[PDB]
Design a protein around this ligand. Structure first.
Ligand code: G7C
Ligand code: CL
Lengths: 219, 215
């Protein structure tokens, strides 16, 4: 099997700047008879199928912007992206088409660097319908922030919570380069009904100081 | 348009068998190599198999050789992957792709989940907008306690797409998935505009339309 190693694994590049992604093949993938290095580059945007950018190491597929260019010979290949756009947020994969199995690199995850953007914070009490079932889910939403790093603490009657929440984060948006994040606090109905004040405290670079959103159970 | 459409994916017991189909249109099917590639959700592309134009040459990744069989029906414009003796490590989105210079015109993919766990439909709960972000309100749906993936969430039957965030599912301590779909809208719309999340969990035949009302 031919092994392809990409570097780096993660790359953060600002809008308008240049990204360099390398692919090292464990053996030559130059087919003499076709006079081609049989390397493909793909872009896979969040929640989308892969898109072919380049084949034969340096031939751009019709409709792919000239911002994308492939170079290299033998075992060392490079994808260069000039004038980085918001819509370039993706994982980039190299693949050899020289000898089966037609192996992929491990991928390079491209982050778009943009200006700091504070999250909008929203809290949602559990629904009456859910409380009937014996469980309380409290949700804290951090909407459209940058960068990714964010701290979310749950406080119930000012007791800091541990072990009883899960976070989920969107991929960077293709247009505004922001993240959104959900923190869900799960309590038994009984535990929920023993406390009054439910609070979500958010720390992020874009905020002057931590922001708290809270509600009083039954108000 | 070149169109590839994968089907036949779903929940299957370890040791079981599945047959994926890829329906090809908008090109001369018998003129091109065809490929299967898979991706474990949140992981990388793994090449699985290909066939030449007539199906006289085929190859397979090491981890599936002897268990999977690629084939094609050039008369019916269909590629197949027969998958036998399935294991947990075969759980992935399976893509078909047309070979030209590289792999092109990838389909949306079909999810294969190899698990002995039971199908369970989600409970859908509203995330209601309340009397407070200035001119912007958030609302949503909590889609809780389902197996397997995936669930799809649309808003107002696909008419509301701006400001929608459907979060990745988290696996809970129970081994059931949970996710939220949220949307930000003008506060000005809350009094007059109806907001309904359309949740579909096809593996359990669970379709829910949940109206989310300001409270
Ligand atoms: C790998 C690859 O490119 N695959 C493509 C394949 O490639 C060439 C083969 O030769 C194989 O090459 P390879 O395996 O590198 O070498 C074998 C090696 O073992 C021996 O050398 C010893 C084509 O013949 C090139 O002609 P075009 O597709 O340009 O013309 C198109 C016409 O209009 C019609 O052609 C297929 C279309 O039939 C595509 O579906 C595949 O994607
Ligand atoms: Cl691979």
């Amino acid at each position: 099997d031919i092994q392809l190693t990409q570097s780096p694994d993660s790359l953060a590049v600002s809008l308008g700047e240049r990204a360099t992604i390398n692919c090292k093949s464990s053996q030559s993938i130059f087919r003499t008879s076709r006079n081609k290095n049989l390397l493909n580059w793909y872009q896979q945007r969040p929640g989308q199928p892969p898109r072919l950018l380049i084949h034969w190491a340096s031939t751009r597929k019709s409709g792919v912007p000239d911002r994308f260019s492939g170079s290299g010979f033998g075992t060392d290949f490079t994808l260069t992206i000039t004038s980085l756009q918001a819509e370039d947020v993706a994982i980039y994969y190299c693949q050899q088409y020289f000898s089966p199995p037609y192996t992929f690199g491990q991928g390079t995850k491209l982050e778009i660097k943009r200006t700091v953007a504070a999250p909008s914070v929203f809290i949602f009490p559990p629904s009456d319908e859910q409380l009937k079932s014996g469980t309380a889910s409290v949700v804290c939403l951090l909407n459209n922030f940058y960068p990714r790093e964010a701290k979310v603490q749950w406080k119930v009657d000012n007791a800091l919570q541990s072990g009883n929440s899960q976070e989920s984060v969107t991929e960077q948006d293709s247009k505004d380069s922001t993240y959104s994040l959900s923190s869900t606090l799960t309590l038994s109905k009984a535990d929920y009904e023993k406390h009054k004040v439910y609070a979500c405290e958010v720390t992020h670079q874009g905020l002057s100081s931590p922001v708290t959103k809270s509600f009083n159970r039954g108000e | 348009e070149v169109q590839l459409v994968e089907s036949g994916g779903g929940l299957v017991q370890p040791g079981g068998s599945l047959r994926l189909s890829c329906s090809a249109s908008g090109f001369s099917f018998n003129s091109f190599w065809m490929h299967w590639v898979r991706q474990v959700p949140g992981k990388g592309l793994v090449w699985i198999s290909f066939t030449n134009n007539e199906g006289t040459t085929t190859a397979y990744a090491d981890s599936v050789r002897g268990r999977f069989i690629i084939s094609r029906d050039n008369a019916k414009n269909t590629l197949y992957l027969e998958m036998n003796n399935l294991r947990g490590e075969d759980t992935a989105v399976y893509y078909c792709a047309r070979g030209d210079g590289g792999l092109d015109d990838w389909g949306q993919g079909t999810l294969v989940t190899v698990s002995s766990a039971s199908t369970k439909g989600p409970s859908v709960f509203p995330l209601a907008p309340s009397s407070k972000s200035g001119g912007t309100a958030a609302l949503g749906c909590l889609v809780k306690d389902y197996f397997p993936e995936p669930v799809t969430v649309s808003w107002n039957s696909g008419a509301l797409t701006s400001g929608v965030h459907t979060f990745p599912a988290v696996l809970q301590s129970s081994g059931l998935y949970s996710l939220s779909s949220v949307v930000t809208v003008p506060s000005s719309s809350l009094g007059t505009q109806t907001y309904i999340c359309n949740v579909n969990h096809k593996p359990s035949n669970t379709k829910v339309d949940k109206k989310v009302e300001p409270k």
